[PDB]
Design a protein around this nucleic acid. Structure first.
Ligand SMILES: [Zn+2]
Ligand SMILES: [Zn+2]
Lengths: 1333, 90, 99
DNA sequence: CTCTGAATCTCTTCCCGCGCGCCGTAGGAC
DNA sequence: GTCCTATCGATCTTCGGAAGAGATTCAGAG
């Protein structure tokens, strides 16, 4: 049936009877000897359908001639047997029964509606106590549960003026008595009666549930099951096994238990069994229904085997093995196979080799499609036989069929889209799949026995889509960043490095070659060496600004290898790229440059030719590796012999008591580290110096042709950290607790490691292996969360028309910059007109894409901050505008309308998740940001600001260094001084926080008493002490309310006033303070009154996206103004923030042990830090704005990848951020029909406010709410996507009671229901449908 | 054979619209097969479609131009039949 | 191993899984995400309706492939209907809608 | 006397394929 | 032997998860 929406709601019992075709009565299915289905059972023929294909069970009719008629020998209706899997039945329970889901969801829906605790409703339902209903003229409330002894009281104290039922009957009577709308009105007016938010929130939840039930056609008693439908039998087959036995079926046994119990209850109720017996039977029946529905939510699951609990309906719905993730989202497909791959170097970039047998077994029908068309076979019957005969003509048919038919290859797992690609197949004799070398990088495919699967696209559109989107040559750029995925392989780069290298003296040196071709001849005639230095006439073509090549020819000083390689580089590049010894880095840009100039078609053939030449000349190289090539520097034995001795000296101090325990350790380890550095440097120097050659006279050194050195230098394999362990020393190691081993592994793998050294190495080896094995799961879970939170977003519009955006600046932290501006802003469109450095002059138009040329133009100027449009700020409803997203990183142009950016971004973020771990510097100009500072006695600039940051701008006018300076620091280099690198810029006390005054004047211990607020310490070191201020915890109110104060005093009654300020120079003391300037002491400006003494990898980002609150929440101040204290710390301290104007009495509780950045009079603003530590993304969004929280998220998730060397385009993160805060909470209901306070989807609230403001009525006011991905994925308005993700047993009830309806918008739902996705070609089809409407 | 499709992508300014147009044309050439506007090389219609696009002689509009016109021809003969039938009854 | 056509499972008509049984490769959720990363919608629709799930469709596809038509009739994945029954077996009335 | 704090309760969750290979109603009454 | 009924309706189902999130209780708290 054609459909356009899916609706979910509660099922009324008469609706269930409408579903059913019969009532199952006998709990029997089939005979244990004959295989006929027993009538009126779980497999009744006349209820669900006949078992035979087109014949009735009774055998009266066996033809289509009697189709649709009803037999009277057995009662079964004869029709297509398939209908047997669609017809349902129903069991009419002898007594009502509560639906387990609605009883025990995350809240209790049945409990919430009646406002009755879940424990008490369960106690009633399981026949433990009575509950009085319609109590009438009795002192018994509306529900007022009462026990049997209490009931025994009411039985005689009152007569029949009260009613107290037990079990589901009482709950059904209560539901049937629910005056829903009147109750909701009364409660929505009672909400205003009290301000108890602790109860107001759950009251809002209750009224929301009541409104959802009122609006929906659902009725309360429908939460209590009365008729239980039975699943169609063909969906729960009782399949036989080897021998005369049938395989056990989980659902069948649960239904059998329910039917038997219910029949027993009916039998008793007919025979008038005593109340105790009928109550026990009813409880057993209720518990049996519980086991049938959601087995496991009971006290204990039932089982019929060695404690293997039986799977229930709810068990089959959800779960990793459930339908959603087992058969709908991912399903096994025909026309597919798998095999072990191997490398075929002869293949082109766009080809792959497949076995003849696999080709025949996948393209079988296509072969038939020729056998009839060729007329060589009569029909399928002979065509299949001929194919079996593997006739030599059939191989010609296969060679014709497979001519231009792509095949899809994908390796498991496939983290990113580059793991699935289309290839043009070629037949191969063997059984392994021939894969291309350059492609193996994309698959992460090591050829050490790696299996890979092939899928055959059948239809025409599938073939075209494969060839146009998934072909190998269409995926040369990585979608995660502007980096080619055809990066040259490990072996090829070795060949190119060997070919283009130059030696001092070599055969055929110094002559003149008339052209590259001749050079090649010389090598192949053996007259010249490949590394010989020679002058060859080179000719190069350069395309003009218009785009036509200009030929220029010249003499060039170069090498024979480079001249040979130049015969492969296309006719558009300068010779300087090949005039250098190429390595895995140097070659890569080369290839990239081709795509920058020539285009895709020249680039692919150039890559293939590079691979061919590299393989050939690497084979000619014969760069073997042997034990003779691992060089131990001779000085190493000395470097050890000295270093150990130094440790001995560090030991001697410990042998003399001249050092502490820890200092000995941290000196020994540092000395060993220095020795290791010396050993490594000597080893590297020896490796490069091992080559010295005679150039016609006198020895001369040069770069080393050592095999290991060429392998390392070319970047193929074995970097410096590898050669250091192979030829230097293994170095230090760490214990499983991470402690540095005092005795390093002073050996290297060329020499033998001893038993203890190997055992030490095993610690780190197993730690790394366990890290990999454990992180491989968290990475995948993060990928799933990302895809299920971002599956909705598609580029569905050209321009949204907005003008906002985000400003991009180079990352300057820890001094020098860590990344340039070009990387951030490349490929985005400008937000507003870009101004020339200076004033009144613009440089780029307001909505122009900043491609490579404009990025170079900006880098030419001194532009550091550029505002560009971002996907988070785009104002497009239920989609994302194309202009914000900007460049498609895999194409280079602007992103097309219809691309699924969400899944691409999720894969881009999640692919490197398996690479993480689960366990002044230069001269410039001084700039001060947020730095309010005062002049001390000496006139130095000492900071009076706590958010002070130090920014340094070089001579060419851009900031290159950034620093943060805490409160109380003295700025030696300030007022825009120019200071050279390494010259101390500022000074600080690294241990304690000092407190300083503004004026110079006398002081007293105002309102302070010895013993009450200060301790008469002695300072045993000298006997003259600095008084220690008593804490709030160490003293009672006699010292807490007597807060220490060091207010500056003068004879005039006031201090020298700052213009416009009336505040006296009042200063105070917090706890743990150490104060020297006692009474009668003159404190000058800038004098320190007193002093107060005092991370991760993958989880650091996983909790960041989930927006988990920090264990140590750095409290940010809100509003603005000047802070204050309230009452002191008892239980936990209380403080108050007083703005200049507005609501002065704003208070907030504060932890005692967290030191405060403000004490009593510090000017404060929204977001001002009161304590150190990580912030809260929720608080940041609430206090500093959407742009601020987006910047925080992007930077704190990029700091994880930058540390590990992974590069991901920042935009790929912002999309996920767009998903986190897709919801908003209403501030004022306004003219909108929205609730007074409610969280509504931001798109809906925005469209409603747009139309409302168009009509001039009061639009709603809202705060965008940052939801972590794990919750926001389940918070969508389409219940199918949420229930397909997790907590299905919860969502399938929350949406059920609400009468939810799905419009099937999004990708996952359309994939589930088997229609075209709203993306790509599917988006094109949907867009055509909507425009033609 | 086609290794790349960049030229056609430059012709039809979208990576997906090219797929759809080529599907239309290759379906035409396959079922009720109209002869292609390009010399064959023992190729499958799929690639032949991607051959025609690069020559710039097939797109949406042209196909629409054909389809509508074809319909008119199929309608025109209808009149010649109907009138003839109306004549033949007399 | 490679499979063209063979055994089909009973409860859901998806092809069997394994080597000792003539089964096909499983198209996991990650592969679906990768296909959605490209604009390939027809590929996904075929892969999850005709090749695997829609019982009526996968025969009509067979005839066309033999006939040389290369056109699919997707219909609706049978497995999905099974899901509905599993939910319709509860106290939940979930149904398709016209508009 | 409850209110609006914490604190202490239960529930949900945990990568993708791929192969082997076994192992798979029970006790009691006519 | 067959075929039956019922399912610790006189035990103790495992202690080598972590966490993260709510939901549910309590506790000074005025
Ligand atoms: Zn019959
Ligand atoms: Zn936009």
């Amino acid at each position: 049936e054609e459909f356009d929406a899916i609706k979910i709601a509660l099922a009324s019992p008469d609706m269930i009877r409408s579903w059913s075709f019969g009532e199952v009565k006998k709990p029997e299915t089939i005979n244990y000897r004959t295989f006929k289905p027993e009538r009126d059972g779980l497999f009744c023929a006349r209820i669900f359908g006949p078992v035979k294909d087109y014949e009735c069970l009774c055998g009266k009719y066996k033809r289509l001639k009697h189709r649709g008629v009803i037999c009277e020998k057995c009662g079964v209706e004869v029709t297509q047997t398939k209908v047997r899997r669609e017809r349902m039945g129903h069991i009419e329970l002898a007594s009502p029964t509560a639906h387990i889901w609605f009883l025990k969801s995350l809240p209790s829906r049945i409990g919430l509606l009646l406002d009755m605790p879940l424990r008490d409703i369960e106690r009633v339902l399981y026949f433990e106590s009575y509950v009085v209903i319609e109590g009438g003229m009795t002192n018994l409330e509306r529900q007022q549960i009462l026990t049997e002894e209490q009931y025994l009281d009411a039985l005689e104290e009152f007569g029949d003026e009260f009613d107290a039922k037990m079990g589901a009957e009482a709950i059904q009577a209560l539901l049937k008595s629910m005056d829903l709308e009147q109750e909701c009105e009364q409660l929505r007016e009672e909400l205003n009666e009290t301000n108890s938010e602790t109860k107001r929130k759950k009251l809002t939840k209750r009224i929301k549930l009541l409104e959802a039930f009122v609006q929906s056609g659902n009725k309360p008693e429908w939460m209590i099951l009365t008729v239980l439908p039975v699943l169609p039998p063909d969906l729960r087959p009782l399949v036989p096994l080897d021998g005369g036995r049938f395989a056990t079926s989980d659902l069948n046994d649960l239904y059998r238990r329910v039917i038997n119990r219910n029949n027993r209850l009916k039998r008793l109720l007919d025979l008038a069994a005593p109340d105790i017996i009928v109550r026990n039977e009813k409880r057993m029946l209720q518990e049996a229904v519980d086991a049938l529905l959601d087995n496991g939510r009971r006290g204990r699951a039932i089982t019929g085997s060695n404690k293997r609990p039986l799977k229930s309906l709810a068990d089959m719905i959800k779960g990793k093995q459930g339908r959603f993730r087992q058969n709908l989202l991912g399903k096994r497909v025909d026309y597919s196979g798998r095999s072990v791959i191997t490398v075929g170097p002869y293949l082109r970039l766009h080809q792959c080799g497949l076995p003849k047998k696999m080709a025949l077994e996948l393209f079988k029908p296509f072969i038939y499609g020729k056998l009839e068309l060729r007329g060589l076979a009569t029909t399928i019957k002979a065509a299949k036989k001929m194919v079996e005969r593997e006739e030599a003509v059939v191989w010609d048919i296969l060679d014709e069929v497979i001519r231009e038919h792509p095949v899809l290859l994908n390796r498991a797992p496939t983290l990113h889209r580059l793991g699935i690609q289309a290839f043009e197949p070629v037949l191969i004799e063997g059984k392994a799949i021939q894969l291309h070398p350059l492609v193996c990088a994309a698959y992460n495919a090591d050829f050490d026995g790696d299996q890979m699967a092939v899928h055959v696209p059948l239809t025409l559109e599938a073939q075209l889509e494969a060839r146009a989107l998934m072909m190998s040559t269409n995926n040369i750029l990585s979608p995660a960043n502007g980096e080619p995925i055809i990066v040259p392989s490990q072996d090829v780069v070795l060949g190119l490095y060997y070919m283009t290298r130059d030696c001092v003296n070599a055969k055929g040196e110094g002559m003149v070659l008339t052209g590259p071709k001749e050079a090649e001849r010389l090598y192949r005639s053996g007259l010249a060496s490949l590394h010989a230095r020679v002058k060859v006439r080179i000719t190069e073509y350069e395309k003009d600004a218009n785009g036509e090549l200009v030929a220029k020819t010249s003499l060039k000083d170069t090498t024979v290898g480079r001249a040979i390689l130049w015969m492969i580089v296309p006719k558009g590049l300068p010779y300087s790229i090949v005039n250098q010894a190429l390595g895995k880095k140097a070659i890569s840009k080369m290839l990239n440059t081709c795509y920058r100039i020539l285009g895709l078609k020249p680039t692919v053939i150039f890559a293939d030719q590079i691979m061919y030449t590299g393989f050939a000349y690497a084979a000619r190289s014969g760069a073997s590796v042997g034990i003779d090539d691992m060089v131990i520097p001779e000085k190493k034995h000395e470097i050890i012999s000295e270093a150990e001795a130094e440790v001995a000296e560090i030991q001697e101090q410990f042998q003399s008591g001249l050092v502490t325990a820890g200092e000995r350790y941290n000196k020994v380890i540092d000395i060993w580290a220095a020795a290791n550095d010396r050993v490594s440097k000597a080893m590297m120097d020896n490796l490069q110096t091992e080559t010295v050659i005679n150039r016609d006279g006198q020895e001369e050194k040069q770069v080393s042709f050592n095999s290991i050195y060429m392998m390392a230098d070319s970047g193929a394999r074995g970097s410096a950290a590898q050669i250091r362990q192979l030829a230097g020393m293994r170095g230090l190691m760490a214990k499983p607790d991470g402690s540095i081993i005092e005795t390093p592994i002073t050996a290297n793998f060329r020499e033998g490691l001893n038993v203890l050294q190997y055992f030490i190495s095993t610690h780190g080896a197993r730690k790394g292996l366990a890290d990999t094995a454990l992180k491989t799961a968290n990475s995948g879970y993060l990928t799933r969360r990302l895809v299920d939170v971002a599956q909705d977003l598609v580029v569905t519009e050209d321009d949204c028309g907005t003008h906002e955006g985000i400003m991009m600046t180079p990352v300057i932290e820890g001094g020098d910059v860590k990344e340039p501006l070009r990387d951030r802003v490349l490929g985005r469109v400008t937000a507003e007109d870009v101004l020339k450095p200076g004033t009144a002059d613009i440089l780029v138009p307001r909505n122009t894409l900043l491609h490579e040329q404009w990025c170079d133009l900006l880098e030419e100027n001194s532009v550091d901050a550029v505002k560009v449009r971002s996907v988070v700020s785009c104002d497009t409803d239920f989609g994302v505008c194309a202009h914000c997203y900007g460049r498609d990183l895999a194409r280079g142009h602007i992103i097309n309308k219809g691309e699924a950016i969400g899944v691409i971004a999720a894969q881009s973020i999640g692919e490197p998740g398996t690479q993480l771990t689960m366990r002044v510097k230069n001269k410039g100009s001084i700039k001060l940001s947020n730095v309010k500072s005062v002049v001390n006695s000496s006139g130095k600039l000492v900071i009076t600001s706590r958010n002070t940051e130090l920014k340094l701008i070089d001579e060419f006018g851009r900031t290159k260094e950034s620093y943060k300076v805490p409160y109380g620091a003295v700025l030696a280099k300030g007022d825009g001084e120019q200071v050279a690198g390494g010259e101390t810029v500022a000074n600080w006390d690294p241990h304690t926080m000092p407190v300083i005054t503004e004026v110079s004047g006398f002081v007293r211990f105002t309102d302070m008493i010895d013993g009450q607020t200060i301790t008469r310490q002695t300072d045993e070191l000298t006997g003259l002490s600095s008084l220690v201020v008593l804490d709030s915890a160490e003293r009672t109110a006699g010292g807490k309310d007597l807060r220490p104060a060091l207010k500056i005093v003068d004879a005039q009654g006031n201090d020298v006033l700052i213009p416009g300020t009336d505040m006296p120079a009042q200063y105070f003391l917090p706890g743990k303070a150490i104060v020297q300037l006692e009474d009668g002491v003159q404190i000058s400006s800038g004098d320190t009154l007193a002093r107060i003494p005092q991370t991760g990898g993958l989880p650091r980002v996983a909790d960041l996206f989930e927006a988990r609150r920090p264990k140590e929440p750095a409290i940010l101040a809100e509003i603005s103004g000047i802070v204050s204290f309230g009452k002191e710390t008892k239980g936990k301290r209380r403080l108050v923030i007083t703005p200049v104007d507005g609501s002065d009495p704003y208070e907030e509780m504060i932890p005692k042990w967290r030191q405060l950045n403000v004490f009593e009079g510090e000017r404060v603003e929204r977001g001002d830090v009161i304590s150190d530590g990580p912030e809260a993304p929720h608080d940041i969004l609430r206090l500093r704005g959407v742009h601020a929280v987006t910047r925080y998220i992007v930077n704190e998730v990029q700091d994880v990848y930058r540390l590990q060397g992974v590069k991901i385009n920042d935009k790929h993160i912002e999309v996920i951020v767009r998903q986190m805060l897709r919801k908003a909470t209403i501030v004022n209901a306004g003219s909108s029909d929205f609730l007074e306070g409610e969280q509504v989807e931001y798109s809906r609230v925005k469209i409603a406010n747009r139309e409302l403001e168009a009509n001039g009525k009061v639009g709603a006011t809202y705060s965008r709410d940052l939801l972590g991905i794990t919750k926001a994925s389940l918070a969508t308005e389409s219940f199918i996507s949420a229930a397909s993700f997790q907590e299905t047993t919860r969502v399938l009830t929350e949406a059920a009671v609400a009468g939810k309806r799905d419009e099937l918008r999004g990708l996952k739902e359309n994939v589930i229901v088997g229609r075209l996705i709203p993306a790509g070609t599917g988006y094109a089809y949907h867009q055509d449908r909507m425009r033609r409407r | 054979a086609r290794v790349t499709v960049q030229d056609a992508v430059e012709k039809i300014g979208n990576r997906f619209d090219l797929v759809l147009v080529a599907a239309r044309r290759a379906r035409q050439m396959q079922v009720g097969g109209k002869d292609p506007l390009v010399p064959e090389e023992n190729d499958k219609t799929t690639v032949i479609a991607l051959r025609e696009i690069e020559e710039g002689l097939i797109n949406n509009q042209i196909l629409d131009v054909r389809e509508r016109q074809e319909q008119q021809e199929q309608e025109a003969a209808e009149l010649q039949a109907v009138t003839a039938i109306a004549e033949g009854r007399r | 191993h490679a499979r063209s056509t063979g055994s089909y499972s009973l409860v859901t008509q998806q092809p069997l899984g394994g080597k000792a049984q003539f089964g096909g490769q499983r198209f996991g959720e990650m592969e679906v995400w990768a296909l959605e990363a490209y604009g390939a919608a027809y590929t996904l629709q075929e892969m999850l309706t005709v090749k695997s799930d829609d019982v009526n469709g996968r025969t009509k596809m067979y005839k066309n492939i033999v006939d040389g038509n290369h056109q699919m009739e997707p219909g609706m994945p049978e497995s999905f209907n099974v899901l509905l029954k599993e939910i319709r077996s509860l106290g939940i009335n979930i149904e398709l809608e016209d508009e």
